[PDB]
């Protein structure tokens, strides 16, 4: 019913969105291969009133007229796709990426999702699946009585059998790279699906075309840096408090109008 109230309401909503992003980043400290999020804000509409540049006199112009702005809205959420610090879990089934590649897994619906998490398990059939049970692509199947699994820097998975002095190859772990990694649509479960803004899925081996190298026994931790999140929490709290003060000022103004 009054412009300032709507503007401050939009400001409150934007600060709440910032706090939501902050809380999502903080809750995922222990998540492997998680990327922190950032919100981008833009100005809302601008009431024109006086046209800036209009003809005030026959030889003078109107410099920077009366533009009245509306509130704020978040543009988009962007991830920071950078290399997270590695952690040694001393597990033959855990693989970490050193560059800018993704693992391709198959959803139960038949469509393919992409995950940077390397915590893998072996199912009852021997196929290398993720922690949720989705099958990696291709089906890196594993023989029955394996003694050790060796995954090289270039994605060659080998199994050492008993009484055989040469390791046997049972698959080839490949990496998918995208033109735009920020455009992948997050669906949860550490899974990203393809969109039209994420380019096309470029399948490649680890070491060529830019795709990263694979390290066995390591996991890629999240890139969330806590101190930035704490300072941003302080920022969000104080900005929210200021906007609530503005809402209160508008309320008192309107009340004074009502009394007369």
């Amino acid at each position: 019913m009054i412009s300032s109230l709507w503007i401050a309401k939009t400001g409150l909503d934007a600060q709440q969105t910032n706090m939501d992003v902050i809380a999502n980043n903080l809750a995922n400290v222990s998540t492997n291969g998680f990327k922190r999020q950032r919100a981008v804000f833009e100005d809302l509409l601008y009431q024109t009133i006086r046209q800036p540049g209009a003809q005030s006199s026959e030889q003078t112009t109107l410099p920077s007229g009366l533009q009245i702005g509306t509130g704020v809205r978040p543009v988009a959420t962007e991830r920071l796709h950078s290399q997270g610090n590695l952690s040694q879990t001393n597990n033959s089934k855990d693989v970490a990426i050193k560059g800018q590649g993704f693992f391709q897994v198959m959803l139960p619906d038949g469509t393919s999702a992409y995950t940077r998490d390397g915590s893998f398990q072996v199912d009852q059939n021997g196929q290398l699946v993720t922690a949720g049970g989705f099958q990696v692509q291709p089906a890196i199947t594993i023989p029955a009585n394996a003694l050790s699994i060796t995954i090289g820097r270039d994605g060659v998975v080998s199994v050492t059998q008993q009484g055989q002095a040469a390791p046997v190859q049972v698959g080839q772990l490949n990496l998918t790279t995208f033109m735009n990694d920020t455009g992948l649509e997050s669906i949860g479960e550490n899974l990203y699906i393809e969109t039209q803004s994420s380019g096309a899925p470029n399948e490649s081996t680890p070491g060529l075309n830019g795709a990263g190298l694979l390290y066995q026994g390591y996991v890629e931790t999240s890139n969330v840096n806590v101190a930035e999140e704490l300072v941003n929490m302080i920022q969000v709290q104080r900005a929210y408090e200021i906007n609530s003060k503005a809402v209160s000022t508008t309320d008192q103004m309107l009340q004074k109008l009502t009394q007369l």
Partner: protein, 50 residues
């Protein structure tokens, strides 16, 4: 907004109370004595600001 260009100028005139008379439709017009001295049509005054 670069296209903004002048089109026309409003005619602004200067007249006191003793010179104008309210016609039957509410529009003021120059009185006879005042019209005889100031002419039929009032020239625009460049000093008038709106």
């Amino acid at each position: 907004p670069n296209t903004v260009a002048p089109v026309g100028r409003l005619k602004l005139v200067k007249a006191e109370g003793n010179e104008v008379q309210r016609s039957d439709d509410g529009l003021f017009r120059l009185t006879a004595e005042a019209q005889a001295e100031r002419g039929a049509v009032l020239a625009a005054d460049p000093s008038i600001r709106i």
